Design an enzyme around this catalytic site. Structure first.
Site, short mmCIF file in Angstrom:
data_model
loop_
_atom_site.label_atom_id
_atom_site.label_comp_id
_atom_site.label_asym_id
_atom_site.label_seq_id
_atom_site.Cartn_x
_atom_site.Cartn_y
_atom_site.Cartn_z
N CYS B 62 0.84 -1.18 0.00
CA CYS B 62 0.00 0.00 0.00
C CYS B 62 0.91 1.28 0.00
CB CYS B 62 -0.84 -0.13 1.29
SG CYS B 62 0.11 -0.30 2.65
N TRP B 95 -7.52 -7.61 4.70
CA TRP B 95 -6.11 -7.82 4.99
C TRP B 95 -5.95 -8.96 5.98
CZ3 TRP B 95 -2.48 -5.74 1.93
CH2 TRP B 95 -2.70 -4.52 1.29
N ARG B 129 -14.62 0.73 6.28
CA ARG B 129 -13.59 -0.01 5.60
C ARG B 129 -12.58 -0.44 6.64
NH1 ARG B 129 -10.87 2.01 0.74
NH2 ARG B 129 -12.31 3.11 -0.66
N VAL B 132 -5.27 -0.30 6.26
CA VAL B 132 -3.98 0.06 6.78
C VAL B 132 -3.70 1.47 6.33
CG1 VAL B 132 -2.96 -2.14 6.96
CG2 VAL B 132 -3.03 -1.02 4.84
N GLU B 147 -5.63 7.07 9.89
CA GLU B 147 -5.44 8.06 8.85
C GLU B 147 -3.94 8.44 8.64
OE1 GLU B 147 -7.52 10.11 6.47
OE2 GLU B 147 -5.29 10.10 5.89
N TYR B 194 -5.37 5.19 -9.25
CA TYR B 194 -6.50 4.33 -8.85
C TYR B 194 -7.77 4.62 -9.69
CZ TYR B 194 -3.81 2.28 -5.02
OH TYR B 194 -2.93 1.47 -4.32
C1 0VS Z 1 -7.21 3.95 -1.38
C2 0VS Z 1 -7.69 2.73 -2.14
C3 0VS Z 1 -7.22 1.39 -2.06
S1 0VS Z 1 -5.67 0.85 -1.20
C4 0VS Z 1 -5.69 0.07 0.48
C5 0VS Z 1 -6.44 0.93 1.57
N1 0VS Z 1 -5.61 2.02 2.12
C6 0VS Z 1 -6.18 3.30 2.40
O1 0VS Z 1 -7.07 3.76 1.69
C7 0VS Z 1 -5.67 4.10 3.61
C8 0VS Z 1 -6.71 4.50 4.72
C9 0VS Z 1 -6.53 6.00 5.06
N2 0VS Z 1 -7.55 6.76 4.33
C10 0VS Z 1 -5.06 6.54 4.73
O2 0VS Z 1 -4.81 7.79 4.63
O3 0VS Z 1 -4.21 5.74 5.17
C11 0VS Z 1 -7.01 -0.11 2.53
O4 0VS Z 1 -6.13 -0.70 3.20
N3 0VS Z 1 -7.97 -0.95 2.12
C12 0VS Z 1 -9.15 -0.59 1.33
C13 0VS Z 1 -10.33 -1.58 1.75
O5 0VS Z 1 -9.97 -2.76 2.08
O6 0VS Z 1 -11.49 -1.11 1.72
C14 0VS Z 1 -7.98 0.38 -2.90
O7 0VS Z 1 -7.66 -0.83 -2.93
C15 0VS Z 1 -9.16 0.82 -3.74
C16 0VS Z 1 -9.86 -0.13 -4.52
C17 0VS Z 1 -10.97 0.27 -5.30
C18 0VS Z 1 -11.41 1.60 -5.36
C19 0VS Z 1 -10.72 2.55 -4.59
C20 0VS Z 1 -9.60 2.17 -3.79
C21 0VS Z 1 -8.86 3.19 -2.97
O8 0VS Z 1 -9.21 4.37 -2.98
#
Ligand code: 0VS
Ligand code: 0VS
Lengths: 327, 327
Positions: B62, B95, B129, B132, B147, B194
């Site tokens: 990530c 995860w 959601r 990580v 965050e 993305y």
């Molecule tokens: C960001 C991002 C992902 S990556 C993994 C995601 N990490 C964060 O977004 C960080 C949390 C916080 N806001 C930060 O600042 O740290 C998390 O770990 N998992 C997502 C989940 O399991 O719901 C994705 O995979 C995806 C896929 C499809 C559309 C958009 C998306 C999309 O927008």
């Protein structure tokens, strides 16, 4: 997408190949057209070269059909062979005389709407693939040939006496060398990229894709030593390499995930690509729209989205100096 | 797929409408680690910076997680912050603590199986959601923050009296420029790859991938004027950009179809990439095996075969000269 005993089988192909590998017309369209109408090395006479008899059915997307167009241009065969271009999108039926798409023209002879129609209009019990390119005899309504590697040899010489442009892309001196080249360049590269891009397992993909770049490296070296594959002359090996090259950056690199290097990263391979491209009347045989809609939009097995990538940057008009450099 | 009022929801998230921007749990965990345990701008107080209390749960794949690891090294927070790395591979239960994969460590605290269980241990009826990174309070058994943008601001000052290395990545004199860069970079670039990758329509993809390369171009002018995005000082806006850059040739180019140019085609961006990568301690935070397994294999939606492209050639160890060019 096969045609069995005269009927189309969309992709309901099928539920066990029960004896098996089909059948008696797994290529019953391998005649040659000839200077005097004599039969070629397979198939039958009397397909004598003449104006207003012959017609090429092609895609603008297919590397196999594209060599026949290149040959028709280099050999001045335009006044002899008129052309129809299937639709780029190959969905449920197979190639399609769907007009609409700029540069797709419909079946501009007998306006069918399926390429399998045309194959049946010449064997209505036909069992086999429905491929481009197709070399078609307006006179006897059938298929002289649907084999790109041979159609280009016909073009090479059959019209010479009727006034084709000068050029022999398979001269006896080099036929051995050309044949060895056509051989590995077909395994490792023409076919190499499809093997990689359609791998099922990851170990299959690594296999294919590794071979692809092992041949790119080896060809980068030969080109290299002299302007073209065998030396100072353009041959059919070069043109066959070339039809794959011109597709590699815009498609095989991201879509078939052959993404280790773009062609525009090799000095010689990229030079070669621009060299042949800039030959007169070769650019017009290249349609990137058909190339890219076809691969991105047809292979739902692999690109479920049908999203066409922006595509690797390239300027094929950049002067290459391979004419000066060599030799 | 989300956690709904306590229960793990694979895909079906959940009853479409009938609730509710997801949700009373959006209310997130947005507390602040502070030097004196006063509350930050959001959440409550009582998260005083201190040894042996706090833990970071990350993915190595990530780029949101990666930020907190980089900031953990530049600030010398390893003595105060121990780390658990989920497994790269996002199966049906988001995860996971599966430790089969090298560098994937399992839950080094509570040996749960699933990251979402951590969220449950801090909350029986959590609904959101399950992301990580997570900044975990061993003492109160809850989540300080999930965050990344705020977590790095806490690492940047909270432990400053406990022996954190000198360094401010968000100094008062640079904050308003950093806030602008951050905004523009997160929209068109950290997030842009993305939106392009998971576009659904040619059109939404066209607009996303355009904005990516348009921002890259502007970043390339900016980084041609000075070592880092705002001058000769490294800041959190650089860090934020860099964790997307580092993923770009290995994954976004091919996997999200952000092709056109590779990062290594830009003089300045690619120098900048090698410049940060080569800082004492950064290289270990980068794991391509996780990065590349995560994106290729987990996104079956977009890459059905889950084959991992061989990947654009690059070598980040090669000297960059940006220490001296400037500036
Ligand atoms: C960001 C991002 C992902 S990556 C993994 C995601 N990490 C964060 O977004 C960080 C949390 C916080 N806001 C930060 O600042 O740290 C998390 O770990 N998992 C997502 C989940 O399991 O719901 C994705 O995979 C995806 C896929 C499809 C559309 C958009 C998306 C999309 O927008
Ligand atoms: C080529 C190629 C295609 S598309 C182009 C194709 N070209 C050939 O025909 C090669 C021989 C030819 N007769 C001649 O030398 O002229 C055609 O026009 N159509 C196919 C069909 O409808 O059967 C495909 O889509 C596919 C998919 C999966 C695996 C391999 C493949 C695969 O290998």
């Amino acid at each position: 997408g096969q045609l069995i005993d005269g009927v189309w089988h969309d992709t309901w192909y099928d539920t066990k190949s029960t004896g098996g590998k089909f059948q008696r017309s797994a290529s019953a369209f391998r005649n040659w057209l000839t200077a005097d109408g004599a039969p070629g090395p397979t198939g039958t006479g009397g397909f004598i070269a003449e104006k207003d008899r012959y017609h090429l059915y092609v895609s603008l997307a297919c590397p196999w059909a594209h060599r026949t167009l290149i040959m028709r241009k280099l050999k001045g065969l335009e006044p002899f062979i008129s052309v129809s271009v299937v639709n780029p999108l190959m969905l449920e039926n197979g190639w399609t005389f769907d007009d609409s798409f700029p540069g797709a023209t419909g079946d501009t002879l007998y306006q069918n709407e399926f390429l399998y129609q045309l194959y049946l209009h010449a064997d209505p019990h036909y069992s086999g693939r429905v491929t481009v390119p197709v070399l078609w005899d307006k006179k006897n309504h059938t298929i002289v040939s649907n084999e790109s590697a041979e159609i280009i040899r016909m073009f090479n010489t059959a019209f010479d006496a009727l006034g084709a442009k000068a050029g022999d892309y398979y001269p006896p001196a080099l036929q051995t060398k050309i044949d060895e080249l056509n051989g590995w360049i077909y395994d490792t590269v023409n076919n190499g990229v499809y093997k990689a891009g359609f791998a099922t397992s990851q170990e299959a993909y690594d296999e294919a894709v590794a071979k692809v770049f092992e041949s790119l490296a080896r060809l980068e070296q030969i080109l290299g030593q002299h302007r073209y594959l065998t030396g100072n002359q353009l041959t059919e090996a070069d043109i066959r390499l070339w039809t794959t090259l011109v597709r590699f950056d815009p498609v095989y690199v991201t879509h078939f995930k052959c993404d280790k290097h773009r062609i525009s990263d090799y000095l010689n391979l990229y030079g070669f690509l621009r060299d042949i491209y800039q030959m007169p009347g070769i650019a017009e045989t290249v349609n990137f729209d058909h190339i890219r809609n076809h691969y991105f939009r047809s292979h739902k097995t692999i690109n479920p989205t049908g999203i066409i990538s922006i595509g690797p940057w390239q300027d094929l008009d950049e002067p290459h100096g391979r004419d000066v450099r060599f030799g």
